Write a protein that binds this ligand. Structure first.
Ligand SMILES: CC(C)(COP(=O)(O)OP(=O)(O)OC[C@H]1O[C@@H](n2cnc3c(N)ncnc32)[C@H](O)[C@@H]1OP(=O)(O)O)[C@@H](O)C(=O)NCCC(=O)NCCS
Ligand SMILES: CC(C)(COP(=O)(O)OP(=O)(O)OC[C@H]1O[C@@H](n2cnc3c(N)ncnc32)[C@H](O)[C@@H]1OP(=O)(O)O)[C@@H](O)C(=O)NCCC(=O)NCCS
Ligand SMILES: CC(C)(COP(=O)(O)OP(=O)(O)OC[C@H]1O[C@@H](n2cnc3c(N)ncnc32)[C@H](O)[C@@H]1OP(=O)(O)O)[C@@H](O)C(=O)NCCC(=O)NCCS
Ligand SMILES: CC(C)(COP(=O)(O)OP(=O)(O)OC[C@H]1O[C@@H](n2cnc3c(N)ncnc32)[C@H](O)[C@@H]1OP(=O)(O)O)[C@@H](O)C(=O)NCCC(=O)NCCS
Ligand SMILES: CC(C)(COP(=O)(O)OP(=O)(O)OC[C@H]1O[C@@H](n2cnc3c(N)ncnc32)[C@H](O)[C@@H]1OP(=O)(O)O)[C@@H](O)C(=O)NCCC(=O)NCCS
Ligand SMILES: CC(C)(COP(=O)(O)OP(=O)(O)OC[C@H]1O[C@@H](n2cnc3c(N)ncnc32)[C@H](O)[C@@H]1OP(=O)(O)O)[C@@H](O)C(=O)NCCC(=O)NCCS
Ligand SMILES: CC(C)(COP(=O)(O)OP(=O)(O)OC[C@H]1O[C@@H](n2cnc3c(N)ncnc32)[C@H](O)[C@@H]1OP(=O)(O)O)[C@@H](O)C(=O)NCCC(=O)NCCS
Ligand SMILES: CC(C)(COP(=O)(O)OP(=O)(O)OC[C@H]1O[C@@H](n2cnc3c(N)ncnc32)[C@H](O)[C@@H]1OP(=O)(O)O)[C@@H](O)C(=O)NCCC(=O)NCCS
Ligand SMILES: CC(C)(COP(=O)(O)OP(=O)(O)OC[C@H]1O[C@@H](n2cnc3c(N)ncnc32)[C@H](O)[C@@H]1OP(=O)(O)O)[C@@H](O)C(=O)NCCC(=O)NCCS
Ligand SMILES: CC(C)(COP(=O)(O)OP(=O)(O)OC[C@H]1O[C@@H](n2cnc3c(N)ncnc32)[C@H](O)[C@@H]1OP(=O)(O)O)[C@@H](O)C(=O)NCCC(=O)NCCS
Ligand SMILES: CC(C)(COP(=O)(O)OP(=O)(O)OC[C@H]1O[C@@H](n2cnc3c(N)ncnc32)[C@H](O)[C@@H]1OP(=O)(O)O)[C@@H](O)C(=O)NCCC(=O)NCCS
Ligand SMILES: CC(C)(COP(=O)(O)OP(=O)(O)OC[C@H]1O[C@@H](n2cnc3c(N)ncnc32)[C@H](O)[C@@H]1OP(=O)(O)O)[C@@H](O)C(=O)NCCC(=O)NCCS
Ligand SMILES: [K+]
Ligand SMILES: [K+]
Ligand SMILES: [K+]
Lengths: 489, 489, 489
């Protein structure tokens, strides 16, 4: 968007002052939408010397004569030209500016407008900026942040030593990565994205996206009336072990609940019988194993089972030992079908295999699994969308990096999912999503499309749970999938 | 509270007469709140010679001129000074006092105010006091008890030969143990605790507590949005046998339904497969046993399974034989994790093991199990909160002594739970609570906090069952846990 | 009530401290009833050195530990014993007292409790008490007055140089005259009268009363089913002139709307025809006059018309000239029926006539008319209930002194009416009330009873008007009378 503002001024010829005026009035309107009538409130506007501060002076000026009181505290040592222009207007209109933040000043105001730093912040916040931000956060006032809460790195969502906790953030043109990834997402509060007059073509030239309800609705496959089960695809799920007998069942029902026609599971005997006792609509093939885990002796049978399906999911509950590792890698190297690779299949995966496959794959790691896959620390991979993009491009796959905000990428397009809640931070949730992705691929969506629709619907289903989210289990999530689909439509 | 009244008079300087006036007016207001307008009712006030009787004279005097009729029957042979003072006022205001209870007098009155004995009662009630109390209980009149129903031992809740059955009890400052433990709890009817002017500091210096909704709400852990399953803890449940295959499943789901991230069960094969057939989100590890019960040969495996969890629960459905006893005690002596110890693990427990553990423990006996643990009779341990406190202090543990009123103590603080109903008097209920406690410990609550929140939520869930409580089963209780959490919030 | 408190302590033996405690707790409960939960508010308690201040210390002490903050500002130079006692308790309980009112202290509090002066105030408030009261009134805080707003003379309702404007006033035992007469009535805000333990016999020995709905309901006459018009009385109204043709009509309908059986008007021809054109149920007898006003030539006819009625009303719209004066006085001296004397009949009345009548009379002056009748200024008679009582006793009549608060007295019992609104400050309103009084006398109520019921119902009817009260007219008031009667029942 730094690019976007510059082209809009330099190539399109929109005066920088017009963009700044539109930015500020949009904050005023946003506030009115959340607070109702503004005339009873007293506003403290905290302005930096940059263009975020300039936007703050526009806000402040537009409140003059209309609200109970407005004061600007200017916290800068110099002003960008647009900030200087809007400072001068604020003062010409009769506005009061002070240059020293006295901690008790907070007592006399209802709303704090945070226009200290925007996307221009670089480096840790120190000194008196930090003391001020901390005082605002302890004040209990309503906080409205201009563009991004001050102290959030707009490219990453990390806190730069400290940051404002906003009730309402008003950003311009498009959301920033820092609104979408945590901790930034938490500090943003309610986000409104304001149209401030950039050409719609430039706004739409962005290559990273938030997954929206309208996007998912347009990707949901068609259900032709004259269909039969094969119309809706066939999935094989290779999953489970004597240790982990539940995973197959959750993956399988995840495929069925999204509309897949036929789902079969290959599960070590007698753990395969667990699935049909719970959901007799599943096909749960018994696999004769030596000690309760898949091994190379099961390679040929699993390849034969794969011949008559559209997609294969592998990994949930397989276990991780050397014999599973041999099986997984040899299977994936030979399988000429799309694969969804999760859990223990990721843990044992040789990435060389991904490079040599002709068929597509989707990988669904959490950050612990991603860290192991690229031999890095969890902190180095968590919310690292550039790493994810590089990995997907280098390995010719779709990568679905699960977290509260889920990143989906094929290395060219990257999508961020914000549906869900903490009830999904519980064993079994990932197994459901794996089945969902395979099911949608089986119905004819591309690996990327299937991943996009699935992460959104999985999170939206969680949110439809009727009692406290901490009590949500994967079994209940399964029941909520068709409701999420209905509500989406 | 004997202490509380004395310090309030002697150190704070509040006249004893002021406290007694406040006590009596609080009974009047309480009655109005339950009966509506008092002017249509005829009141029979039964006064002893102590301060409870004095409170009764205040009630009676305050009804004069405002209700249809008031009569006091004075049943004492002498009067405390405050009782004498309020007797004289009652008579000066025109009140009628008789000194002989004629059984037919009950016919002419609507409400009986029981001010015979309060917390001053010592020893069995005999003679004419007993005949009177029995006549009141056969009368079918509305009964309001001042402080405690006469005949209840306020320290224990036991009936002292006979006691008044009250519709409404109005007590002063704080509830008494006798309101909270049975049979006293039953005889109290609806309880109101009136503020009669003790300093809030003295009221708050009490070391025993009733577990309230506000206490539990403040202890419920946080659900940070940017979480993953490990944020919410990991539990291992060592449970079950060839005899008792259901217990593990109920304990495990009890952990999951309270928001725990990961739950694994160690259960003798093939009984472990029962769990995942019902709830495939559980991990149910098969343990190779000789004859269907844990023994020392499973010690090393269970220790290895414990390395990657936060808390271990042990006991439900283990069975009780010598080989289980060897396993339990050796496991607990070696385990360096918090333990929740229930059921058959309590039955075989060597308490020496508790003393030598560095890690904490919570024990969850019913009175039969407690009796066996301390080698006493059920009657000697039931509702024996002092024994429970001594046991917890001596063994460095939290003790959760289950009954209709549940006692939770670490030997310094003692909490009483009054949520629940008789649907919990059924097999499986305790197994659920064990999982709940372990789950909350795994989420970061202290053993005492986890026990407090769990007993309350377990009982409150029971009360949310929509049909007759006698039909409640543990499976339905599990379903109701997240609703109890929602309602609590 | 000074008497009442003293007898309750000295004869009945209630400790003065008990009465003061009950007074203060009643203010707390009253506040809770109006503000809801008190725990979120910060209270500033302003205490004088008298017993009102003592009551304030009780309030303050009872808020300690339960609300957000409590501060007492003590504004006195010495303390009554009970005030000293409750000051010491407040401090022992940890309460903060300051002895200097800093104007900015108001900023830190939500509720001001006014316990500066009660019924003990004598003389104009000067100096720093006045500055404080004025600051409280400019503060916009919620104000609760203990007993009476400080600065109101509790015997008269006059402001003693300045006074507190309360949102809520809590008084003890009975309302004071100062709550009922203006300006005091305005400054009182919402009034609650608290029972603080005086014997009901002493509370009921008061000889002045507020007219209540229950009193009026018990006085409303019976409507036996087997009745006929004569059962419900007959009224003659002597009223009107060529100047004032509407008055008769309003008086007449006032009698009919309260249930009178027969109403006839004697009105100068042709103004008599106005009445039946509007309400043909009236009998409107034409009286042949010389120049449009009653005179002595009409004396005999009016006496004949009076023979067959129960009550005669005279005065509305008669005009005031010498010939009307001759007629009125000679008529009233000869008439041996109860008379209701209003308006121009009062203006020309010789009070010697009242003394010599054997039959009763009710007089209904406004303060201008009363002033003329006793040859005093309006300021000397307005709300002067002692003058009214003396006048009624000396002249053997009921006096109904109309104003926003209406005084009704026969010289032994005095009643205050507080129903009504400013829509009654408009021509025609008084003419309606005159008809109402005559009607009720005709139905068998005593002059005093009829006056009591009428003033209440007249005011209550005004309040039932559905649109803005300033638009109420006498015609609409007439329509609302039967609704007031229904609502009363
Ligand atoms: C203009 C833009 C290209 C980036 O620069 P900018 O907007 O001026 O940047 P900000 O207002 O966020 O902040 C810049 C100021 O932050 C402060 N700053 C940055 N890092 C800091 C640090 N860690 N410690 C202290 N101060 C720091 C400085 O005051 C800095 O200027 P300075 O370093 O010369 O002192 C653009 O991305 C932008 O923020 N505008 C958004 C669009 C908009 O607001 N709409 C229209 C108006 S142009
Ligand atoms: O040999 P062990 O007695 O340890 O156990 C038997 C099998 O269970 C496997 N195993 C035991 N626990 C396991 C676990 N936690 N995950 C995966 N495999 C496991 C072992 O790898 C072994 O199989 P393998 O030799 O074919 O690799
Ligand atoms: C399943 C089992 C292996 C536990 O593993 P797990 O918790 O699922 O471990 P994972 O590979 O899935 O990785 C979890 C890690 O990924 C990372 N992680 C996952 N999601 C994350 C996110 N959103 N953000 C940050 N970190 C995240 C964290 O580091 C997490 O560690 P933590 O749980 O300690 O916080 C184990 O309980 C079991 O089922 N079997 C026990 C068998 C055994 O090993 N011993 C006995 C022999 S039979
Ligand atoms: O601990 P946790 O709850 O398992 O996970 P957290 O999100 O708090 O942080 C884990 C790591 O992810 C990193 N992470 C968190 N948010 C991030 C963001 N938006 N961008 C890049 N990395 C991020 C942290 O730097 C941390 O790194 P470290 O522990 O190696 O220093
Ligand atoms: C005062 C207090 C310290 C304890 O003593 P108390 O209140 O006078 O005691 P009670 O009114 O319950 O009863 C005392 C009387 O009970 C009766 N009594 C006790 N046991 C009895 C027995 N089993 N058989 C017959 N009578 C018995 C007696 O009449 C006894 O006095 P007595 O033994 O000398 O004859 C205090 O705990 C209390 O009960 N007051 C509660 C607080 C209160 O009421 N608010 C303010 C007023 S002080
Ligand atoms: O010898 P039995 O034929 O009685 O039964 C076989 C096993 O079942 C156990 N057993 C039988 N019923 C049992 C029960 N009700 N609870 C616990 N153990 C039981 C026995 O203890 C025995 O095991 P052990 O010798 O290792 O202690
Ligand atoms: C489970 C089994 C052992 C029955 O035991 P149980 O009822 O659960 O016995 P517990 O140890 O739990 O103790 C129950 C006692 O505790 C006490 N108790 C529990 N809660 C109490 C409370 N709230 N208040 C008072 N007493 C209480 C009572 O004494 C109760 O006895 P009661 O049921 O007779 O009234 C048995 O049915 C079984 O499952 N297996 C049978 C195996 C066998 O022994 N024989 C065949 C060989 S295979
Ligand atoms: O019979 P039950 O229903 O199993 O249990 P109950 O509550 O009726 O009583 C069982 C025992 O607990 C005791 N108990 C019950 N209420 C008690 C109380 N509030 N305080 C102390 N002990 C109590 C009884 O004294 C009884 O003792 P005993 O039978 O040895 O004489
Ligand atoms: C006690 C009672 C007989 C009258 O006296 P009182 O209550 O102490 O009087 P108040 O509190 O209203 O005020 C007395 C004080 O007002 C102040 N005062 C009166 N007129 C004043 C004036 N115009 N200028 C300054 N101060 C004045 C004084 O401080 C005076 O005492 P002081 O003249 O010796 O300095 C009684 O009518 C009363 O007010 N109590 C009501 C009942 C009650 O409160 N319930 C129970 C408690 S007793
Ligand atoms: O002589 P005028 O021309 O003034 O008017 C004729 C009559 O109207 C009367 N009159 C005029 N205006 C009047 C008024 N405002 N109120 C009462 N009488 C009035 C006069 O008194 C006179 O009657 P009177 O002589 O019998 O008293
Ligand atoms: C009716 C007419 C005489 C006006 O008189 P009125 O306002 O009704 O005068 P009243 O006798 O009723 O007395 C009103 C006074 O009583 C007092 N008053 C009434 N109620 C009061 C109360 N509640 N509190 C205080 N004062 C009150 C006031 O002093 C009031 O005076 P104000 O209206 O100036 O404030 C006149 O308009 C008229 O109808 N005819 C005009 C004839 C004339 O005189 N001249 C032409 C010759 S034909
Ligand atoms: O002017 P108004 O609105 O016609 O009537 P008000 O009520 O304001 O006052 C009129 C007179 O009545 C008096 N009055 C008002 N309220 C009073 C009260 N409650 N007690 C005694 N007299 C009162 C005033 O002292 C005033 O007297 P003044 O003007 O001769 O000095
Ligand atoms: K900002
Ligand atoms: K009692
Ligand atoms: K006052």
């Amino acid at each position: 968007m730094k690019e976007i503002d510059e082209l809009t001024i330099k190539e399109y010829g929109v005066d920088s002052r017009i963009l700044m005026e539109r930015a500020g009035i949009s904050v005023v309107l946003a506030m009115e939408e959340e607070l109702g009538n503004l005339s009873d409130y007293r506003f403290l506007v905290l302005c930096g010397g940059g263009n975020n501060g300039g936007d703050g002076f526009v806000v402040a000026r537009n409140l003059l004569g209309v609200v109970k009181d407005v004061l600007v505290v200017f916290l800068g040592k110099k002003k960008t030209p647009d900030c200087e222009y809007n400072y001068g207007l604020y003062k010409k209109f009769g506005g009061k500016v002070v240059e020293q933040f006295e901690p008790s000043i907070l007592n006399e105001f209802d709303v704090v407008v945070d226009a200290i730093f925007g996307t221009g912040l670089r480096g840790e916040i120190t000194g008196e900026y930090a003391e001020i931000i901390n005082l605002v956060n302890k004040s209990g006032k309503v906080v409205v942040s201009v563009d991004v809460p001050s102290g959030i790195d707009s490219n990453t969502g990390k806190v730069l030593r400290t940051a404002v906790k906003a009730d309402l953030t008003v950003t311009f043109g498009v959301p920033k990565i820092g609104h979408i990834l945590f901790p930034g997402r938490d500090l943003t509060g309610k986000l409104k994205v304001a149209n401030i007059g950039h050409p719609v073509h430039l706004i739409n030239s962005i290559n990273r996206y938030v997954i929206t309800r309208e996007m998912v609705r347009s990707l949901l496959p068609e259900r032709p009336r004259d269909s039969h089960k094969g119309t809706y695809g066939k999935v094989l799920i290779i999953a489970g072990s004597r240790l982990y007998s539940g995973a197959p069942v959750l993956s399988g029902m995840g495929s069925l609940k999204v509309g897949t026609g036929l789902v079969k599971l290959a599960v070590p005997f007698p753990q395969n019988l667990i699935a049909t006792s719970r959901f007799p609509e599943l096909i749960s093939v018994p696999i004769d194993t030596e000690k309760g885990f898949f091994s190379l002796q099961n390679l040929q049978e699993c390849l034969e089972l794969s011949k008559d399906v559209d997609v294969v999911a592998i990994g949930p509950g397989l276990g991780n030992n050397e014999h599973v590792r041999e099986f997984v890698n040899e299977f994936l190297k030979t399988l000429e079908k799309p694969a969804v690779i999760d859990a223990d299949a990721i843990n044992v995966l040789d990435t060389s295999v991904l490079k040599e496959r002709k068929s597509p794959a989707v990988l669904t790691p959490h950050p612990g699994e991603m860290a192991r896959l690229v031999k890095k620390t969890v902190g180095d991979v968590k919310y690292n969308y550039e790493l994810a993009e590089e990995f997907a491009k280098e390995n010719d796959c779709v990568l679905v990096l699960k977290s509260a905000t889920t990143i989906v990428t094929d290395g060219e397009k990257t999508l961020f999912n914000i549906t869900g809640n903490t009830g999904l931070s519980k064993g079994g949730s990932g197994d459901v999503l794996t089945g969902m992705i395979a099911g949608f691929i089986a119905q004819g969506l591309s690996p990327l499309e299937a991943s996009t629709v699935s992460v959104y619907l999985h999170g939206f289903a969680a949110e439809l749970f009727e009692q406290d989210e901490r009590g949500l289990t994967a079994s209940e999530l399964l029941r909520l999938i068709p409701e999420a689909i209905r509500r989406l439509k």
